[PDB]
Structure formats: C-alpha cells, structure tokens
Write a protein that binds this ligand. Structure first.
Ligand SMILES: Nc1nc2c(ncn2[C@H]2C[C@H](O)[C@@H](COP(=O)(O)OP(=O)(O)OP(=O)(O)O)O2)c(=O)[nH]1
Ligand SMILES: Nc1nc2c(ncn2[C@H]2C[C@H](O)[C@@H](COP(=O)(O)OP(=O)(O)O)O2)c(=O)[nH]1
Lengths: 153, 153, 149, 149, 149, 153
C-alpha cells in the first residue's frame, strides 16, 4: 500500500511531567503502532512558546498560558505515521478532560482543561510547523521499523 | 463560570469484591486525578441499604436490590473534585455493561446489568446524600493533594 | 448460550498481542471455550471469507491471514457476539475509538490485528469452520453468579 | 485462619498508589477482610511505634505517619503475613528487589509507602490496634477452591 | 532451537490468567509456536507426572489437572526452558519471589496456576506428549534481529 | 534530609525502540520515584559509541557492539535521585536477560545479552561521565518535583 506518512508534534506538558505520565503517554502511541522520530525533555523558552501559541497572543489568558507552559520542563515528541495527526487527536481526547472519553489520554488521566497533560497537532499543516518550531534541524531520527510489514499493508 | 469542588459516592458492589477488582477501580479514579477522601470495606446493614435505594422502593425489584446489596461486603468510597460526579458516571459507563463503551469500567470489566460492578452517585445532590449516608461522621478524611496545582489551574 | 468466534491475525501474533487480546476478553467476563494457534490453509481461509470472493482485495486477504499463524478462539456468554465487536473497534483502527482493541493497538485496516463474528449466525458458522470435533472445551465458571444474576 | 495488617502510608496516598497496592494483594490471591482510609490520631501512631519513643527519629516518624490520611488493611490466608512481607519488600526501597512494592514504587526508607505486620502475632496486635471490631468483614470467596486445596 | 512446554493449570483458567500469563512470555521476547485449550485426560495427566506417582498428593494432583480445561503451550527460543522456570517462580507460590508468575498470582502449592518443563529434554518430551504432530506452527518473528544477534 | 543526590545515565538501546519499549522503560523509573532531568531520542555516531565503550574496545564483541548501538536511534536519559545509580542498575537486571531476575527490566523484557534493551551507569563517576558524554551543556532540565516531599525527607 502507498500512502504518505505524516508527522505530528505531540507534547507532554508541565503537569504531565510532574505527575509522571511521560512513560505512559509514549507507551500509548508505541502500542498504537506509530513511529517515534523526535523526542526530548525541554525547558521551553518564553519566546518559542509565544511563537507556538502565536494565534492566541491577543487573548487574555495568553499571559497565564505562556507562564504555565514554561513553568516547568515539557517533553517534545514527533510521531510519524499514516493518518497519525488525526489519530493522535483521537487518542488524546477532548480539550476538556471531564468531557474526554474514557480510554483517551485526557479522559483517563486528567480532570481540568488548563491542565490537560498533552498536546497533539490539530492538522498535518500544524504538525509540520510545530515539529519545525520545537525541534532543531538534525534532532529528528528516522528509522525503518522491523514491524513495517505488520503495521501497514 | 467556575464550578465548585464536588463530592461523589462511588461504591464497589459485592461482585466487584468477589472478582478482586477493588484495587483497579480505585486506581482508575486515582489515575484520573481525583482525590479519595473516603474508603472502607463495609457490610451494609439492611436499614442503610433501604435508604440508599429509597427512590426505587416502589419498584417490584426493590427487594432484590436490598437483598443483593446486603448479600455480601462492599467497598464504600467518597471522591472529591470539580465535576467529579458527572465524570465518575462517565468512567463507569452505561448501566448495561454490554452497552457500556470500551474504556469505561463496566465497558471493559462487566457483562450483565445485574452484576455491573460499581455504583456512582447520579447527581451532585445525591453524592452528598450517599456519602453522609454510608460514612459515619468521622470516616471522611480531608487532605491537601501535593499535586493540586498540576491537576487544575 | 451464545458463542462467538474471535481470531488474532498474523500481525497480531508478530506484534505479540495474543495475550493482550485474550486478557481483554477474560477481564470483560466472557468464558473462553476454544483456543488454538493455527496455520490457516488457503482453501479454509477462502471458505471463511466466502462472501468476499468476488471482491478485489480477496487474494491479498487470503495471503494476509495465511502469511503467518493465527490464534483461533471461541468465547461464550450472553450477547458476547455484539459485545466482542464493540471491544474490537471499527474496521479501520484509525477510526476505532480509544479503549477498543483496534483503537489502541492498530493503525491500518489491512492490518487490524483481530477478528470477531459480526452476527450470531456467523458465530456458529465460523466456530464450526475453524474448530474440529471436540477441540472446544466446556467448563463451569466459579464466578458465574458474580457475572450474571 | 491467618491475617495480617497492611497499611498504605501517607506518601502512598499522596502518590495515588492505593489502588495499585490493593490490586497486588488481590491479584496475589489473599482475601481482603478490612479496609479504610483513616486519619491516625497521634496517640494511636505513638502506640503503634511505642517501642521507638526513645529514638531520635520518633518526632519525625509520628509527624509522617499522621501527616496525611493512611489506608488501613487486613488480609486473610495461610502464610499471608510472610508473603505480604515478601510482596512489600525490604524496608529500604533502594535495596528492595524489583517486583516488590517498595522496590518498584519507592525510593527512600522514610517514604517507603507501605507497612506489613512482620509476624503473625504482630498481625493480630496491629489489626487490633488500627481497626475497631465491626470494621472487619467476613465473606465467602467464590474462588477459594481455585486458590487453595 | 530449544523449546519448552508451558501450561496454564485449571486454576489459571477459572481466574482469567490465560492472557496475562501468555503476555509475560510475549513481552519477554519468546516465540509462541504451540497453543490450544485442552481438556486433559486422566491417563495423560498421569504420564506427565510420572515422577510424583508414589507421592501421597498424586491422586489429588491428577484430579486437579483434570478438574477443568488447561491451556497447553510451546515456546521457542534459546535458553527458553530455563528462562520460563524463573518467570514461573518456585513451586510454592508463597516462596516464589515477586516478579514471577507464582510469586505475583498464586498462594498455595496445589494451585500454582502454571507449569514449565524443568529441562530442555523434558521440554521436548512434554511437547511430544501434549501436542500432536502439526499442532505446532513454525514462523519467524520480524523482530528476530533485535532479540538476538 | 542531608543525602547526596547523584545522577545516572540511562539509555534505551536501538532494540528497545524497535520493540516499542521506550515508554514502558521510562515508566519504571517514573513510578520508582526518580526524577527525569535529561531525555532525548538520538542517533549515536560510531565515534561517540566507542568513547562510551572504550573499556571494551579490546573485546571480540566490541565491533558488533559498536554497530549494534548505532544501528538505529536510542533514547538517552539522565535520572537524578539519592542512590539512583545503584538502584537503576538493580532495576535493570543482570547483563544477561536470561539470568536477570523477573521484575527487573532485562529479566522481564529481553532474552539475550547482545540485545539487552537498556544501559545504566555502573558507578556514580561513570554516571557523571556518560551523562556528560551523551548530553550537551544545557540539555539537562532542572525542576522541582511537587512530590519531592513525599518521595524523600
Ligand atoms: N497437591 C500438591 N501438589 C504438589 C505438592 N508438591 C508438589 N506438588 C505439585 C505441584 C508441583 O509443581 C509438582 C511437582 O513439580 P516439580 O517440582 O516436578 O516441577 P515444576 O516445578 O515444574 O511445577 P508444575 O509441573 O508446573 O506443577 O506437583 C504437594 O504437597 N501437594
Ligand atoms: N554483542 C555483544 N555484546 C556484549 C557481549 N557481552 C557483553 N556485551 C556488552 C553488553 C553488556 O551490557 C556490556 C558489558 O556491561 P557490564 O560492564 O557487564 O555491565 P552492564 O552496564 O551491561 O550491566 O558489554 C556479547 O557477547 N555480545
């Protein structure tokens, strides 16, 4: 089968780190069958995070948002796969954890919106933008999976 | 508008114990991020069980509910958190396990309405009712969660 | 009592999800009455996919389920047929909801790791097709009363 | 039948390990007969640790054991005391072996998340010190015939 | 390549441990080449436990092994026989260390949920006794290069 | 509590990645209670892998080793904690996954020495060394665990 493998940026937030969910979140996607090509614990500089949420820079929560997202280290992840962006969004769950369906990362492991543990790109366009914003040039590591023949047709 | 801290009475029904599921159910709620302020293996006295199911006292099966809930030990739990009530019902799943969705407790662990493992208050008003009903005035334990600031803003 | 047929496909084995899938049905509360690693011969696979014989993918499908061993299973319980389907998830893993088998453990339709009868009729058919006279095992669950009224 | 006293300490609750610890003993096969989240008043704690009153760490200990609610437990089964001591692991989480509770989930003796009666006589003493009578519950385990002969 | 016979005793099935026990061997890295739920006949139960024939617990043993269906398994991998022994843990569940199957999920010797050949030749001998000719399925793991050099 | 906190270098070898065990491994230490201060997927250059295994350079397996450790990305890690070095090694198991006791990382998830899915510093000094060899000045993230007070005195 031929079908482009998109990339999506997935980020475990400060709270996710504090609660020790870094291993758990990663394990969810590893079991799903997606490839990890970019990974790193990272203390996000204020500028980068402000660039990341550039679109929300006018909002009244923006200050508080940047404050939190930089208040502690986060984990930067880049996942490759076919239809992985939307898939990631599904596995993550609704923005509001209380409304997230059990089985999803937020519905299983979080309770409040302002602390929803993780971020998934909302589109392949943003997946590219974010992976290029949070990751330096040669940080990504591409590799052929040994299970490639058993993950995809 | 911001919602107040809430309390709910979650109960592991007789079958939950027989199948050694007390631990996993407590875990699902500990993992979600709520705070356990009430817990005890309890032998529900007939009078207490009667008050618990008072809204069904007119039902022809009312006897079964009382009889059954008194047939063996149960685990009483009192959980706290903003929106914990509506959330607990969500992690628990539809009454008929066969219909509860994969990911919910009943959805992943049960097969018949009658032996649907756990119970959670159906409303914030009923949560306070059941907690005060099942727990003796000194059985509730209040404490400050060290992860409070990472669970909610 | 209702019985359904559930099978882990070659990719489920390769990826080592046999124990996982089984555990999920055990925990749910259904009784396992049939189990066996089996290398499916072409003709039997074709028989299994009888109705898709005119389809375009048919051959690929036949290769896929014979490209490695499978693990046949016979599960019993009231309404197990539909429940099993719900636990397996949508045919397309990307579409199946998190919490289901394909929703958590697969990424593509052509390799969606598991199978479940879609009807009580096919349940008997498929079980009667993959299991031989006597390979099934009956037993009384000690937790029977704590699983059903 | 033999019963032992197991208690999840304050750090255990603070770290959301109650469910996990209970599950281990459940999955092991012993029967739970007593359970409760309890706020240990200083005197009960000092009586439990009666023998250490003279030691310099006494103050710290009492503060710690009462710094938050604990979860009291009572389990039943032949050899449950020693086994529970084995499942829990050496006093020092760093020396505790991988597979044991403290070994898998803790990092320091002063925060070694759980307790377990070190002998059957102590099991009775502690269950009697931490529980009130009506608190223990007796019941018949459906799976007994499959747990023992 | 060395093979060993692993089997889930009847107490394992009644307690829903089939999937969990297989997973321990899938996660370890070993290859499943034999599997089937089987109702063990008294005669076959006797040949297997020939060495314990003159033991006083023998009779109870034979009735136990025949008390319900069991799950027969064959795993491949160099050193598997010895590795399975460890994963299984000491005969008396109460003495098997945490981390092992008997140490985490059993409480008495007469209901130790699992079996494993104690040597390579007993593995060969046991697979020939529990599995018929083609019930074994030969296949190669796509992860071969990452499990052994 | 005046106890000295050391750091240890823990790395997920190429096979760990191939086998989707990155998460599981991370969760073992996360749940143990140690702190993650360094983490990154990385494709190791022969030169770096040799200066890392210089003490085995004369061995007959060295050549293969070097190629194995560089045959694909690995996941570098820096863990902090009192006695984390010795603990981490205990948590990993014997060099031979067939000997490693069940419950340890290698005894639970591997079947052969040359593919023992993970590495951990064998001493506090090699701890400092390896972290310095694999992590650049500034890749390590310092932070305060909200549970620090419940993990230690
Ligand atoms: N009912 C009963 N069974 C016993 C007693 N001692 C031993 N057995 C059973 C369970 C033991 O695993 C078996 C003797 O087993 P072996 O030491 O020959 O081998 P093994 O360690 O592989 O365990 P297995 O065949 O899996 O049950 O017979 C006893 O006192 N009472
Ligand atoms: N490919 C290959 N690698 C080997 C062989 N023997 C040892 N090694 C490698 C992997 C071992 O982890 C490493 C030696 O490690 P060690 O100093 O005994 O301690 P450890 O940090 O591995 O626990 O050398 C071997 O026989 N073949």
């Amino acid at each position: 089968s031929m079908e482009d493998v998109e990339e999506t940026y997935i980020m475990v937030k400060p709270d996710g780190i504090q609660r020790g969910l870094v291993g758990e979140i990663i394990s969810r996607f590893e079991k799903k069958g997606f490839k990890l090509i970019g990974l790193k614990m990272f203390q996000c500089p204020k500028e980068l995070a402000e660039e990341h949420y550039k679109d929300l820079s006018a909002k009244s929560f923006f200050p508080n948002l940047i404050e939190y997202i930089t208040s502690g280290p986060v984990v930067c992840m880049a996942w490759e796969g076919v239809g992985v962006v939307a898939s990631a969004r599904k596995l993550i769950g609704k923005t509001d954890p209380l409304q997230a369906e059990p089985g999803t990362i937020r519905g299983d492991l979080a309770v409040q919106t302002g602390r929803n543990i993780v971020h998934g790109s909302d589109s392949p366009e943003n997946g590219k933008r974010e992976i290029g914003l949070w990751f330096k040039e040669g940080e990504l590591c591409k590799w052929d999976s040994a299970l490639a023949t058993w993950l995809r047709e």
